[PDB]
Design a protein around this ligand. Structure first.
Ligand code: ISC
Ligand code: MG
Length: 378
């Protein structure tokens, strides 16, 4: 049995659930969604009361928000939801046997290696200057297949290969499915308590648990990545100052893993005002310098002049919140948009003065391989 493409699914060490039905869609842009006087929040709160009044106990709001919060949002309240056991689902997925044979008929890197290296070069150059210190640049892989892609079977494969990550499956207004295995927590809020766990900095994992246990330790030392990382953490520090009652931040990062990568992480733990819910804080933080750059608005402008595509939901956030200030939001990376027989993958890095284009090209390549492995490609 597999999940139908019109259900939301979210797999997390916090709350893991599915959803059924669609009481109300919510397209409203999330810009200035960090202040509760915002159209986004007033509309959001309007719709929650609408839902409760109309008979829905414990409404939740689910879906994704795009990189650029001006662009519209892909949220909606389901008619219902249904908790499930993370560990139970890991085990069923690892046994899910029957897969789909897929024939690719086109595969396009957008852009290809050379154009990407020139974009990495022209971006690193501009970080050396007073104009920006960090920009994140991304690329895509477009895949056309000869038959519609079964979203449910693919999701089982993704769980089996990515047991530990924040795994999501989002129905879109166009009939598509946004799907991925994010390692990066952008914002959890459990009652009054909140955390965020930004990543930045990467190294390949190795098959041998000797060269693996040390390729990591290298990551912990590499000044390139340690500096990559500090830009993200200083910025999130400043932004949370007058938004959080308390706030604890380690000054040095720690190692975490995906099946493909070592990453550097810094956990944030704080308490926030009753003025705040899961999305006001998520909208505040996102995008961090791990997904856009630093300074944030200066780096969006390099991204627009350099990236030959619209990121749309990629590099956004995906998740949920309820009517009572709680929720979880993870960054939309290690992901794909599926629709009928067409798929788009996404990956970004991670660009400062010391970054070589061959390095970042291959870094994004390893990140893309999470979703390529789900598809059975290299
Ligand atoms: C943009 C991505 O990663 C971000 C978060 C973890 C590692 C990153 C890096 O080392 O450059 C990126 O800041 C992606 O996986 O597509
Ligand atoms: Mg990087």
């Amino acid at each position: 049995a597999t999940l139908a493409p019109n259900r939301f699914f979210f797999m997390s060490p916090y709350r893991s659930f599915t959803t059924s039905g669609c009481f109300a869609r919510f397209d409203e842009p999330a810009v200035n969604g960090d202040s509760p006087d915002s159209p986004f929040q007033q509309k959001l709160a309007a719709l929650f009361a609408d839902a409760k009044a109309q008979g829905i106990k414990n409404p939740v709001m689910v879906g994704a928000i795009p990189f650029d919060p001006r662009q519209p949002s892909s949220l909606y309240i389901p008619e219902s939801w249904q908790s499930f056991s993370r560990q139970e689902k890991q085990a069923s997925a690892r046994r899910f046997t029957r897969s789909q044979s897929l024939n690719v008929v086109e595969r396009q890197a957008i852009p290809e290696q050379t154009t990407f290296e020139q974009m990495v070069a022209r971006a690193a150059a501009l970080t050396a200057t007073p104009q920006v210190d960090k920009v994140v640049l991304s690329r895509l892989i477009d895949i056309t297949t000869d038959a519609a892609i079964d979203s449910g079977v693919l999701l089982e494969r993704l769980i089996a290969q990515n047991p530990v990550s924040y795994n999501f499956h989002v129905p879109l207004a166009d009939g598509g499915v946004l799907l991925g295995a994010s390692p990066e927590l952008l914002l959890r809020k459990d009652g009054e308590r909140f955390s965020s766990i930004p990543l930045a900095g990467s190294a390949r994992r190795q098959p041998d648990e000797v060269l693996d246990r040390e390729a990591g330790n290298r990551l912990l030392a590499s000044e390139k990545d340690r500096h990559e990382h500090e830009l993200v953490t200083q910025a999130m520090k400043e932004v949370l100052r007058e938004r959080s009652s308390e706030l604890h931040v380690p000054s040095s990062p720690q190692l975490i893993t995906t099946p493909t990568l070592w990453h550097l992480a810094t956990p944030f733990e704080g308490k926030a005002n009753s003025q705040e819910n899961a999305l006001t804080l998520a909208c505040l933080l996102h995008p961090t310098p791990a997904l856009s750059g630093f300074p944030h608005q200066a780096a969006t402008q390099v991204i627009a002049e350099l990236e030959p595509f619209d990121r749309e939901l990629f590099g956004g956030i995906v998740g949920w919140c309820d009517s009572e200030g709680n929720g979880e939001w993870v960054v939309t990376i290690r992901c794909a948009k599926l629709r009928e027989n067409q798929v788009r993958l996404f990956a970004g890095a991670g660009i400062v003065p010391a970054s070589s284009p061959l390095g970042e090209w291959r870094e994004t390549g390893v990140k893309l391989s999470t979703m390529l492995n789900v598809f059975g490609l290299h």
